[PDB]
Design a protein around this ligand. Sequence first.
Ligand code: HEM
Length: 154
Amino acid sequence: MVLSEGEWQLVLHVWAKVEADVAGHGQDILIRLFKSHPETLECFDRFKHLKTEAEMKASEDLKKHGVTVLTALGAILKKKGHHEAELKPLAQSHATKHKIPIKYLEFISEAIIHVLHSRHPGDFGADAQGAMNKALELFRKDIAAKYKELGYQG
Ligand code: HEM
């Protein structure tokens, strides 16, 4: 994959909006993931009992984890594909400790796209959606290659 500089700019321009309310984006993303693909909730021992959207919005622990996820993702996107150093510790933990399959990274990618549409209509048009899709796909493909370098099938 090779994104155009334009595509990267579309990505980073919408990312600036995410940065204006990182915790709100993070909550909405994790909640949308858990709603759309409930099996994913089982991966979080401390959260896995939460039932309703309002319950999840009140979890300080879920909100903190959202920030943690989006901070790491932000640093990776800003590398414009030159993210081997940032991916390594993340592949390590997600392959070996959390045991997350690549398909669940696909599920969270869908949730990111939904939330960006939900919070930023007018500024998340087809072109920005396409560029964000491509950046997230690159991320997932590169993680999957890292898993295999560690000897794991993601
Ligand atoms: C954009 C995609 C993702 C990013 C950037 C991301 C990032 C992170 C970061 C930075 C951490 C803490 C440090 C670490 O353990 O490596 C973490 C922990 C974790 N991640 Fe992810 N992650 C993503 C997707 C997922 C998905 C889809 C799942 C499960 C469905 C998952 C499950 C977990 C779990 C279980 C932990 C440990 C949580 C805790 O006990 O506090 N991750 N992730």
